[PDB]
Amino acid sequence: DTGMITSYLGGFQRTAGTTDSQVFIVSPAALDRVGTIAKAYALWRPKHWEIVYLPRCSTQTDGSIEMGFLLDYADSVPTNTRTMASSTSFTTSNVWGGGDGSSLLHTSMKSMGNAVTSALPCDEFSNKWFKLSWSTPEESENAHLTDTYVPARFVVRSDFPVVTADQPGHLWLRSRILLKGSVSPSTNL
Amino acid sequence: VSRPLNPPAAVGSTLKAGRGRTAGVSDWFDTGMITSYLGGFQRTAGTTDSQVFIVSPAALDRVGTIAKAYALWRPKHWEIVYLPRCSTQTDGSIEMGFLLDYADSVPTNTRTMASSTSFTTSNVWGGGDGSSLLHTSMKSMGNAVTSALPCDEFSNKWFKLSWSTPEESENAHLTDTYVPARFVVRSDFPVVTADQPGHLWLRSRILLKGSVSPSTNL
Amino acid sequence: VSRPLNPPAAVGSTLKAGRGRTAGVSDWFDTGMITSYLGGFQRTAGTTDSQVFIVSPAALDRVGTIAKAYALWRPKHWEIVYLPRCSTQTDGSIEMGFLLDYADSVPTNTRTMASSTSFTTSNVWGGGDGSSLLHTSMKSMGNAVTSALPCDEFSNKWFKLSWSTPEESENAHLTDTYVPARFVVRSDFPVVTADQPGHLWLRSRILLKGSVSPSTNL
Amino acid sequence: DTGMITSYLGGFQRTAGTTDSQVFIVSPAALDRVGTIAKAYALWRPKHWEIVYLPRCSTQTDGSIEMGFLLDYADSVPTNTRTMASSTSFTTSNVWGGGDGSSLLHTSMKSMGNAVTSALPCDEFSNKWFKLSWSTPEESENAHLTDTYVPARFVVRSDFPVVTADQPGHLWLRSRILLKGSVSPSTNL
Amino acid sequence: DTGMITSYLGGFQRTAGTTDSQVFIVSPAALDRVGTIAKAYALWRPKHWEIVYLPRCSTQTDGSIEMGFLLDYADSVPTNTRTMASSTSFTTSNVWGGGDGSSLLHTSMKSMGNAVTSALPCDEFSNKWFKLSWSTPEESENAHLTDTYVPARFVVRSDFPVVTADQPGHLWLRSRILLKGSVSPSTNL
Ligand SMILES: [Ca+2]
Ligand SMILES: [Ca+2]
Ligand SMILES: [Ca+2]
Ligand SMILES: [Ca+2]
Ligand SMILES: [Ca+2]
């Protein structure tokens, strides 16, 4: 058991003229510390996987951010807000809100207050062991196949198109996972 | 007489859906024991001929659209009941069973069919008592002809709701990852003229979990 | 030791579905007070510009597919709440209201909009208190900016669930027979650059009645 | 439940190439008895799967044997001692020893003495059922897909590349599995 | 806590010089798996660090192996049997034996039989934390300084100077350590 670990997931990017839509595969692979530790193991299971958004913009900034999870790799990614609002653990807030979530990064408290978070319901995987993968899914790979080793996908969206591109905030991950099975990091793919 | 005003720099909010329902629909749902029409028992001329029914919520007509609002599902009970509707002068019998591996081949004779999971057979005009099992939660009894999928093997699994049918090009091993099982019905008596001596009713119960936009659900 | 046998001439049954459910789904359904996303408040450059939302279960994303399993429906409550998400330096206001006759024209100015049913207006950064109304059954209070359709006019009517959008060629009088009403949102302040200062949330409750196969439901 | 059963897995083959390692798929398919019995069932679960190495050579034979498991079909096969050592249930020993393991073939006790064994940690599959397959994984089959019906792969390699090919010992398997669901043997693929 | 982990330490190399002894620094740095895992932490503490020697040669091989630990970086490395015998956890045995130790690689039991092992007495570090280092001690570095971040040195030597260099056996490490404090792997030096 790794315990709760905080990882920088990436920034919240807003490209001009189009509504942003970043998709993150739920895997330790890319995480600075977790990714490294995980490489020495063959299997893993998510116990807690919650993303907390922290703003870095001015209160004058317009727009909101929308977050949620997709549990079937075959399901398509939401293109509008109404659709996004039906996803798992949907959360939305002004692009400048969420500052109260700061403490969640070094604590284990439950998201509360004006915190902007979205947590993957991990009860779904309490009996499964996923094989740790370090490669990106092929374009040609059948969705049903990918779904077998991808717990879920995390989606981040912008509610409306901006004139000028910017990065309103940061996406942080609080995760706790179980690692099992011995393998050489170099042979772990 | 006078009230203070101190507007914020901006106004907004933070939405986090999830009481246990998203967008007005529960995030978890149990259908309970329900009864619906599966299909008719069709008799034809080829011996190889058999009917195959994939275990999926898509088989439920009304329940189907409801399931479309969920991401995962699990079979808690899936039992087929055969109801005869023919003269007792009708020859032949019916054979039913389940195939748990999408890779396994479909039985083409009685000897082989008899080895399928929850196999059961009967003369085509038998099983009349089964009609009392419909719409009730009673347990099989009388000459009732039934076949129930042992759902204990899925008690830890969560299948993703898939709405498209498996292609030909699809590797059986892959199809097997999202298809709990296949139900097979066979006639041991090839007939000259096609007919339908009885019907197949489904007594099932499934769990639906995880919110998702119906239109994005594939 | 010996049991008598006296087979019938034929065997069969009589099925009559209808406990209060057909094919495993109730024949009547009440959603209760639910909350879902309607759309964003979009500001543009034309003055005539206004957004129109047709009152229909199709507006509910998850509830939509469920409704597809029913033939009739009735609005018991349909109220829109405006939630601001912008700087308090944002100029302009928002105007909302309902049109009860599909034939009536859409308002193009404030004077006219003000006469719509359940009309309400406010500066675009006002209505912050409305966020507490979401997911709850509380009643409007605080600076909450809301507009509720007086559903008492439909308490005897049963609308047929229609899934296709009204055509152009369709006579307004005809469209009016299956569209309870239209909700209109207008900006009084034309802007240089399009933006979205706030959002529109829907607090509703509808009744669904009558069993029907989802695929045949149009 | 089959109970414990001893099966001849094959011989330990030493050759001239370096990246020469034998790989066995964890499945009842090829087993003399277990294979026949399993044919009548649709699903299976490994409760115990342990390989015991037994010598058949002179005490003058140099070199050692290395065994271990790969839990992800996508992981690559170790090519040197350093990385083989990181496989699951890794074990190693000189090529002519391991006699204390012979009794493990009719007993059910645990590996002790100089016995050379490698036991797959089956607690990983305690909650799932695999569909019995009798065909060999296609060449073109996506590793991720093969992984779905292959519990694990067992790997055996030499550290001492030899001049003349030989067979220093035998690989014995003592397993115990659960079978579930009936199916006609001739239908079982 | 990493739990017990098996790592390939290297081979037992015999050469022509007499004062020829292999020296290993007690650290996770070079270990295949432990090294990767440790990279994500800033501090560590050895809970168990034991080396097991395993043969790979003919029973005709003459000579013996000697292993032990040096707890002070300033102490000199033994050059003969008499003084090697005084090292910490000293152990010795002929070069072709030690087979009873193979099971210690997947077990957690204690050295018994003809097993050849040397376990560092870790009760010495039960109250301290070492800062994980990944660089090799400078040549010019004062021994006293190096001693501050090196728990101990493990020494292996032959008593039988050979004519032709060879490798009679392998050196295996089974360790268990505690890691504490987070740090970015790429930042960890
Ligand atoms: Ca892997
Ligand atoms: Ca789906
Ligand atoms: Ca209709
Ligand atoms: Ca099979
Ligand atoms: Ca360091």
The 3 state secondary structure assigned to chain B is CCCCCCCCCEECCEEECCCCEECCEECEEECCCEEEEEEEEEECCCCCCEEEEECCHHHCHHHHHHHCCEEEEEEEEEEEEEEECEECCCCCEEEEEEECCCCCCCCCCHHHHCCCEEEEEEECCCCHHHHHHCCCCCCCCCCCEEEECCHHHHCCCCEECCCCCCCCCCCHHHHCCCCCCEEEEEECCCCCCCEEEEEEEEEEEEEEEEECCHHHCC
Q: Which residues sit with Cβ closer than 5 angstroms to ligand 3, an ion? A: C 161, 217
Instruction: Please indicate whether, in this complex, the C-beta atoms of B116 and D182 are within 8 angstroms of each other.
Output: yes
**CA dist., res. E25 & res. E32, Å (int):** 15
CB of B94 within 8 A of CB of B124? yes
Instruction: Please indicate whether, in this complex, the C-beta atoms of C37 and A82 are within 8 angstroms of each other.
Output: yes
Note the residue count of chain A: 189
CB neighbours (10 Å) of residue A139?
5
C4, burial (CB in 10 Å: exposed 0-12, middle 13-18, buried 19+):
exposed
**CA dist., res. A21 & res. A23, Å (int):** 7
CB neighbours (10 Å) of residue D15?
14
**CA dist., res. D168 & res. A122, Å (int):** 49
**CA dist., res. A182 & res. E8, Å (int):** 14
As given in the structure block, the two tokens for residue B51 are 């009917």
User: Which of E71, E5, E76 is closest to E37 using CA atoms?
Assistant: E5
CB of E44 within 8 A of CB of E28? yes
- The secondary structure of residue C175, as a DSSP letter, is H
Q: How far is the CA of A189 from the centre of ligand 1 (A)?
A: 4
**CA dist., res. C162 & res. C159, Å (int):** 9
As given in the structure block, the two tokens for residue B74 are 């699990």
Which of D70, D83, D86, D118 to probe by mutation at the A interface, max A CB count within 10 Å?
A: D86
User: Which of B162, B168, B164 is closest to B180 using CA atoms?
Assistant: B162
Instruction: Please indicate whether, in this complex, the C-beta atoms of E58 and D63 are within 8 angstroms of each other.
Output: no
Question: E37: part of which helix (H) or strand (E)?
Answer: helix E34-38
User: Which of C206, C146, C200, C198 is closest to C180 using CA atoms?
Assistant: C206
Q: How far is the CA of E52 from the centre of ligand 5 (A)?
A: 28
Ligand nearest to the CA of D71: 1
Which of A75, A81, A120, A129 to probe by mutation at the B interface, max B CB count within 10 Å?
A: A75
Cβ contact E–B (≥3 pairs, < 8 Å): no
As given in the structure block, the two tokens for residue D179 are 């079978």
| D–E interface: beta-carbon pairs under 8 A | 81
Question: Residues in chain C whose beta carbon is closer than 8 A to a beta carbon of chain B?
Answer: 7-13, 15, 17, 19, 22-25, 31, 34-37, 60-66, 68-69, 83-88, 125-126, 128, 131, 134-135, 204, 211, 213-215
Q: Which of the four CATH numbers 2.60.120.20, 3.40.50.2000, 3.60.110.10, 3.30.70.100 does domain E1-189 have?
A: 2.60.120.20
Tokens 């900034």 found at? A61
Question: Residues in chain D whose beta carbon is closer than 8 A to a beta carbon of chain B?
Answer: 40, 42-43, 127-129, 131-133, 135, 138, 141, 145-146, 148-149, 180-189
**CA dist., res. B180 & res. A136, Å (int):** 28
CB of C82 within 8 A of CB of C94? yes
Q: How far is the CA of A40 from the centre of ligand 2 (A)?
A: 32
Amino acid at C123: N
Task: Compare CB distances from C66 to B61, B65, B86 and report the shortest one's residue.
Answer: B65
**CA dist., res. D183 & res. D87, Å (int):** 35
Note the residue count of chain E: 189
CB of E116 within 8 A of CB of E101? yes
**CA dist., res. A110 & res. B124, Å (int):** 61
User: Which of D1, D97, D16, D114 is closest to D47 using CA atoms?
Assistant: D1
From chain A, the residues in CB contact with C89 under 8 A are 60
From chain A, the residues in CB contact with B153 under 8 A are none
Task: Compare CB distances from B12 to A84, A93, A127 and report the shortest one's residue.
Answer: A93
* Cα radius of gyration rounded to whole Å, chain A: 17
Q: Which residue of B has its CA nearest to A113?
A: B14
For chain E, the chains sharing at least 3 beta-carbon pairs closer than 8 angstroms are A, D
Read off φ and ψ for residue B52, nearest 5 degrees.
-120, 130
Q: How far is the CA of D72 from the centre of ligand 1 (A)?
A: 5
Which of D94, D103, D158 to probe by mutation at the E interface, max E CB count within 10 Å?
A: D94
C36, burial (CB in 10 Å: exposed 0-12, middle 13-18, buried 19+):
buried
Amino acid at A138: E
A180, burial (CB in 10 Å: exposed 0-12, middle 13-18, buried 19+):
middle
Q: In a 3-state reduction of DSSP, which class is residue D47? A: strand
CB of D184 within 8 A of CB of B116? yes
Distance from CA of D50 to the nearest CA of E (A): 12
Distance from CA of B211 to the nearest CA of C (A): 8
Instruction: Please indicate whether, in this complex, the C-beta atoms of D147 and A131 are within 8 angstroms of each other.
Output: yes
**CA dist., res. A53 & res. A102, Å (int):** 9
**CA dist., res. C80 & res. C94, Å (int):** 13
CB of D16 within 8 A of CB of D161? yes
Read off φ and ψ for residue B172, nearest 5 degrees.
-50, -40
B155, burial (CB in 10 Å: exposed 0-12, middle 13-18, buried 19+):
exposed
The two beta strands, B21-22 and B145-148, are unpaired
A170, burial (CB in 10 Å: exposed 0-12, middle 13-18, buried 19+):
middle
Instruction: Please indicate whether, in this complex, the C-beta atoms of A32 and E5 are within 8 angstroms of each other.
Output: no
Render chain A in DSSP notation, one character per residue. Answer: ----EEEEEEEEEE-BTS--EEEEES-STT-HHHHHHHTTEEEEEEEEEEEEEEE-S-TT---EEEEEEES-TTSPPP-SHHHHTTSEEEEEEETT--GGGGGGGT--PPP-TT-EEEEE-GGGGTT--EEP--SPPPSSS-HHHHTTT---EEEEEESS-BSS-EEEEEEEEEEEEEEEEE--GGG--
Q: Which residue of B has its CA nearest to D138?
A: B171
Instruction: Please indicate whether, in this complex, the C-beta atoms of E182 and A39 are within 8 angstroms of each other.
Output: no
Q: How far is the CA of B126 from the centre of ligand 1 (A)?
A: 54
As a whole number of Å, the end-to-end CA separation of chain C is 61
CB of D114 within 8 A of CB of D100? yes
CA-based max dimension of chain B: 97
Question: E147: part of which helix (H) or strand (E)?
Answer: helix E143-147
Distance from CA of E144 to the nearest CA of A (A): 32
For chain A, the chains sharing at least 3 beta-carbon pairs closer than 8 angstroms are B, C, D, E
CB of B85 within 8 A of CB of B130? no
Buried b (16+ CB within 10 A) or exposed e, D168-189: bbebbbbbbbebbbbbbeebbe
Q: Which residue of D has its CA nearest to A133?
A: D74
B106, burial (CB in 10 Å: exposed 0-12, middle 13-18, buried 19+):
middle
Amino acid at C63: V
CA distances from C10 to B126, B193, B197, E32, E82 (A): 10, 19, 11, 77, 103
User: Which of C201, C185, C196, C202 is closest to C113 using CA atoms?
Assistant: C185
CB of B19 within 8 A of CB of B178? no
CB neighbours (10 Å) of residue D5?
17
CA distances from D163 to A122, D158, E164 (A): 54, 13, 19
Distance from CA of A168 to the nearest CA of D (A): 37
Q: Which residue of D has its CA nearest to B118?
A: D182
Distance from CA of E184 to the nearest CA of A (A): 6
**CA dist., res. A6 & res. E108, Å (int):** 33
CB neighbour list of residue A11: distance below 8 Å, 6 or more residues apart: A167, A169, A170, A171
Render E43-73 in DSSP notation, one character per residue. Answer: EEEEEEEEEEEEE-S-TT---EEEEEEES-T
CB of B112 within 8 A of CB of B84? no
Task: Compare CB distances from E105 to D91, D95, D159 and report the shortest one's residue.
Answer: D91
User: Which of C87, C127, C64, B30 is closest to A85 using CA atoms?
Assistant: C64
Could you tell me where the DSSP H helices lie in C69-199? Answer: 110-113, 172-175
Instruction: Please indicate whether, in this complex, the C-beta atoms of C69 and B69 are within 8 angstroms of each other.
Output: no
CB neighbour list of residue E164: distance below 8 Å, 6 or more residues apart: none
As given in the structure block, the two tokens for residue C48 are 């005539």
CB of E24 within 8 A of CB of E154? yes
CB neighbours (10 Å) of residue C134?
17
Task: Compare CB distances from A76 to B12, B174, B218 and report the shortest one's residue.
Answer: B218
Task: Compare CB distances from A86 to B72, B158, B212 and report the shortest one's residue.
Answer: B212
From chain B, the residues in CB contact with A145 under 8 A are 174, 177
Render E71-109 in DSSP notation, one character per residue. Answer: S-TTSPPP-SHHHHTTSEEEEEEETT--GGGGGGGT---
**CA dist., res. D110 & res. D112, Å (int):** 6
Instruction: Please indicate whether, in this complex, the C-beta atoms of A182 and E33 are within 8 angstroms of each other.
Output: yes
Question: E166: part of which helix (H) or strand (E)?
Answer: strand E166-182
**CA dist., res. E155 & res. C89, Å (int):** 75
Tokens 């469209």 found at? C175
Q: Considering Cα of E13, then E15, then E18, then E20, what sign does the dihedral take?
A: negative
Ligand nearest to the CA of B56: 2
Question: E34: part of which helix (H) or strand (E)?
Answer: helix E34-38
**CA dist., res. D131 & res. B177, Å (int):** 10
Distance from CA of E45 to the nearest CA of A (A): 17
Q: Which of the four CATH numbers 1.10.150.20, 2.60.120.20, 1.20.1280.50, 3.40.980.10 does domain B1-218 have?
A: 2.60.120.20
Q: Which residue of D has its CA nearest to E33?
A: D86
**CA dist., res. C136 & res. C35, Å (int):** 8
**CA dist., res. C62 & res. B212, Å (int):** 8
Task: Compare CB distances from E182 to A33, A40, A182 and report the shortest one's residue.
Answer: A33
Q: How far is the CA of C56 from the centre of ligand 3 (A)?
A: 12
Could you tell me where the DSSP H helices lie in D10-151? Answer: 34-38, 81-84, 143-147
CB neighbour list of residue D145: distance below 8 Å, 6 or more residues apart: A145, A148, B171, B173, B174
From chain C, the residues in CB contact with A64 under 8 A are 85, 199
CB of D50 within 8 A of CB of D119? yes
Domain ranges of chain A: 1-189
**CA dist., res. C91 & res. B144, Å (int):** 74
Which of E37, E180, E182 to probe by mutation at the A interface, max A CB count within 10 Å?
A: E37
CA atoms within 13 A on the CB side of E38: 25
E108, burial (CB in 10 Å: exposed 0-12, middle 13-18, buried 19+):
exposed
Which of B16, B63, B65 to probe by mutation at the C interface, max C CB count within 10 Å?
A: B65
User: Which of E97, E72, E101, E100 is closest to E87 using CA atoms?
Assistant: E72
CA distances from D18 to B76, B213, C128, D78, D146 (A): 52, 54, 72, 11, 26
Cα torsion B36, B41, B46, B47 to 10°: value is 100
As given in the structure block, the two tokens for residue A158 are 């912008």
**CA dist., res. E176 & res. C167, Å (int):** 73
Tokens 């996972």 found at? A177
